[PDB]
């Protein structure tokens, strides 16, 4: 959020070409889409300047499959957070339950700002990395 152009390659959206001949307002062509399933595309994606190839709104991924909910327990990666899904597991012999949990690494777009303690909902995508298969679609706590 201090520069866009940090890497050695030119960061740009693929096949979105801004014609150097013309001169208008609305400075650059920015491609964005709605991810579907009633998730609202955030204004920071529509108006921003970040590139973020793995974004569910401006980038080349699609949300399909499970929609999950967790609480952010780690933000120390770059564009990646770890959420914690807590559930109760039933044991039939003793006729009662026990607390269990899983950690899910999810990708977070620069449209969203999360801290530790926020509740997020994530949507399944194709494999992003070795462990990441989920992508943040709405941050709605603090």
């Amino acid at each position: 959020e201090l520069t866009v152009q940090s890497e050695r390659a030119f960061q740009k959206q693929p096949h979105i070409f801004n014609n150097p001949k013309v001169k208008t307002s609305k400075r650059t062509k920015r491609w964005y889409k709605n991810a579907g399933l009633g998730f609202k595309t955030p204004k920071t994606a529509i108006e921003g300047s970040y590139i973020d190839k793995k974004c569910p709104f401006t980038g080349l991924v699609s949300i399909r499959g499970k929609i999950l909910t967790g609480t952010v327990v780690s933000t120390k990666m770059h564009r990646t957070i770890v959420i914690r899904r807590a559930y109760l597991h039933y044991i039939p012999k003793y006729n009662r339950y026990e607390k269990r949990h899983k950690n899910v690494p999810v990708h977070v777009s620069p449209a969203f700002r999360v801290q530790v303690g926020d509740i997020v909902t994530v949507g399944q995508c194709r494999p992003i990395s070795k462990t990441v298969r989920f992508n943040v679609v709405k941050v709605s706590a603090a």
Binding site: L88, Y90, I91, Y94, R96, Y97, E98, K99
Partner: protein, 144 residues
């Protein structure tokens, strides 16, 4: 509140307590440590063949006055030495020497059976012929 936890989310404590206290048993500990596979002469099988080493005159415990007529046998699969009690009246006159005997337990699940101090096995067959068939003169032995 009767000891143990009763809460609806307290299944983990109950499970691990049951495992820890399951180790206090005899059959469970024996089956899970696998002492039959490791520290048993038969190695967990029901029967075993062996080779007779000598004939013993083990005397019974008190109060009982007798000579119990067992044999020492070296197991064929292990090479382990084993004492086996030759069951009936006069049946030690079949079990003479260097023979292939078949052995079983006595039924006491690894314990020494009676007044007989320290034998845990009995003879079933000698030289491929069963001992009761020899005893009831249904069959008779080969030469060797």
């Amino acid at each position: 509140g009767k000891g143990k936890p009763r809460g609806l989310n307290s299944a983990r404590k109950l499970r691990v307590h049951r495992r820890n206290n399951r180790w206090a048993e005899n059959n469970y500990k024996k089956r899970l440590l696998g002492t039959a596979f490791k520290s048993s002469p038969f190695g967990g099988s029901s029967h075993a063949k062996g080779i007779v080493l000598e004939k013993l005159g083990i005397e019974s415990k008190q109060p009982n006055s007798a000579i119990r007529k067992c044999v020492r046998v070296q197991l064929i699969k292990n090479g382990k030495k084993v004492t086996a009690f030759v069951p009936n009246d006069g049946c030690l006159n079949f079990v003479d020497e260097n023979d292939e005997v078949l052995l079983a337990g006595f039924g006491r699940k690894g314990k020494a059976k009676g007044d007989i101090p320290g034998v845990r096995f009995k003879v079933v067959k000698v030289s491929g012929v069963s001992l009761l068939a020899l005893w009831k003169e249904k069959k008779e032995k080969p030469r060797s």
